[PDB]
DNA sequence: AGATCACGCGCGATATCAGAATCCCGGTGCCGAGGCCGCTCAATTGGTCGTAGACAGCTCTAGCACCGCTTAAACGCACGTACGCGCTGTCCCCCGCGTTTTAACCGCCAAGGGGATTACTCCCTAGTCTCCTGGCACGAGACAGAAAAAAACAACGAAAACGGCCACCACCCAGA
DNA sequence: TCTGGGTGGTGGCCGTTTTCGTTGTTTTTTTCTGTCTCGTGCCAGGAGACTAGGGAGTAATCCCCTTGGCGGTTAAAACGCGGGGGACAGCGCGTACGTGCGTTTAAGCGGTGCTAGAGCTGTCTACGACCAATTGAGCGGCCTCGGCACCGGGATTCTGATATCGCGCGTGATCT
């Protein structure tokens, strides 16, 4: 499932980041980093949804979770 | 700034890309929205010098 | 009364007069020596003046050293043992009343 | 005789950099990322539902974070007189950012 | 006919590293830093007074920030297969941190 | 007050680097560090003086500096707050 | 943890150095106070491996 | 010519001769901490009233799920080239140690600006009832922009021509 | 007249320029569709007018502490000399990504169904703000003392070199 973050997708993300040449092992490292980031954000979002006594994670929960970590996100009813 | 960017793109309606361009190109706005990510904004076209062909 | 326009130093004049290649410089300098046979003993000394910019005269160290007392100054102010060590700005401009 | 038009290595890379810095669409396929988000969440709470906008916000934040991380990684690699990003570059970028201990 | 006891270059540097990581006293001299603080403040409001505690707080914050910056700088210098920190290292550290544009 | 940034002498920057674990320091590092320190102090004292002015005080108190640092994300313990 | 650090130094009293050691040597606490400066705290003694002699 | 033994040279390890810096052990004076005392302000006890939140019922929106096609994208494989990495040599920049100079630090004295507090008073803000019009939700319509197909053009990679540098031959000058 | 050196011309090799075809991308005209913008209607939040109270403005007093300055000590900063180790430029290898073509997978889109839970509404109760009384926990201050900072003397690494001793390699001598 984490492997659903394919090698070409990480290549595209690196390219959008201005990366010209990518090492072979960068893909597994990037998968790990993305997993850590998603773990933090989703943990905070689920905390927010639990505190609201909801079984559905709303975009507002994600926005608040991101705002908590200093990654304010615009465009989802912030 | 966003309408300026939209004109440069020959578009009459501001989309998130234009807002991102206006914010990031401007130094002061970019500093204000330093820790902000604009959905569907993309990034400024920027390639490091050493990566360009000789 | 400047000549104005563009002025070249002796070194750049020689650079453009020689083209920096060695064979033409040889064809020029050997000819100079040949035409200066009367003073061939001084030939190359005469030759090398043209390629040198003007330089202020200063005694080489092998003559000043003969006298330990003497010593050059900041810009060539040629000093002796009789000249007081200069004071610093701290000793003059900062001394209190 | 015949010869393919193979571009010198590093040229299509520049073309892709230009193409992907000029666009804004998300670079990770929606469905695999949604499945990943659901799997990560199921650790914290069972039988969770996600608003489509919630997963979209997660994807946008994740992609922006990864792009910024790759920018810093590229800067780190160039600092090392290299052109390729290697895992030590990501590790240094994260360590300096303060993310990784 | 004897030679003095010169430590090999890099030995006294390591001894100093140990000594200054062991201690806690401020490393910048107090009066010069106070004068610098007042001079910088002179450009925002004239005839300002400073509580000694205020100058001490500024000095502690500045020294902590500089020490952290030098840690990151050393990390970048080592990343480039170097042992000496150079201004490019500080610039990369600041750029990755997000301080410098 | 003129040319006080040079009051952050070369040995002081050397000590700060050593506390940072630096073994060898380039010659150009000192001027760069002085510039960085000037930028940091300018950013902090600006907010400190803003707080002082809002309180209608002529004296910058340690709590103004603490508030400024906390605002910038560099919370400082040991001076109140 | 601060008292443990003070004991390690044969000191009856906790000083800011001991608080800094306690906070920084503990992963969770150091993460809680990641963006905090402790006056007179100092730093954790560590030297990068490459800088040591061989 | 090959093998063994002895001597000489080179490299590694230990010791050491030292001497340098650090840590430790002891005595000492200190001032910073812990503690006791007194006063008072803020927290606790008791009571009221009102609205905020808990709970049940209902609605329907949105999430989930499933299916089936099509087709963009991932996956896989191969050739190779160019980038990473190791080794090496050179140069000088930076570390180390030492006089020499500077000014930081301490401490002590004198002055007063301004922080901090107190008392008085009023002008500003909360609160409330009545009025209404600006802002929101819903509906609609149409044109800005996505898409798309085709042409134009604007970046990527091979052989000939021109120019520059090196080598060889011919001619001229100088020397023998 | 012969040989050497230098200049001039011709030929060969290398570098640069151009010169060309090929993909990839940009531009341009046509189509068409769905979201942006405008209008309509209702309602609920903002406005208006008014009263009450106290937060804050303002003046006066005072007592801290921030500023200034001055001298003595000496720790630190500076400047210089010297050397070596580190930066870095270069070279060579090798292999590991990149580019491209083919095959495979599953993302994506459109469509329909189901119901779970999020939202809204009504009702009710009990929890918290508010108020008054009061007393006790917390705070300021003072005193005593002992934990730790200072300074001096001593033990302990320990870092760097040289040298001694041991081991290994090479050269010489002797034996087979």
Swiss-Prot record, chain C:
Taxonomic superkingdom: Eukaryota
Location(s), subcellular: Nucleus
Function: Catalytic component of the RPD3C(S) histone deacetylase complex responsible for the deacetylation of lysine residues on the N-terminal part of the core histones (H2A, H2B, H3 and H4). Histone deacetylation gives a tag for epigenetic repression and plays an important role in transcriptional regulation, cell cycle progression, DNA damage response, osmotic stress response and developmental events.
Other known facts: Present with 486 molecules/cell in log phase SD medium.
Assembly information from the UniProt record: Component of the RPD3C(S) complex composed of at least EAF3, RCO1, RPD3, SIN3, and UME1.
Name of the featured protein: Transcriptional regulatory protein RCO1
Species: Saccharomyces cerevisiae (strain ATCC 204508 / S288c) (Baker's yeast)
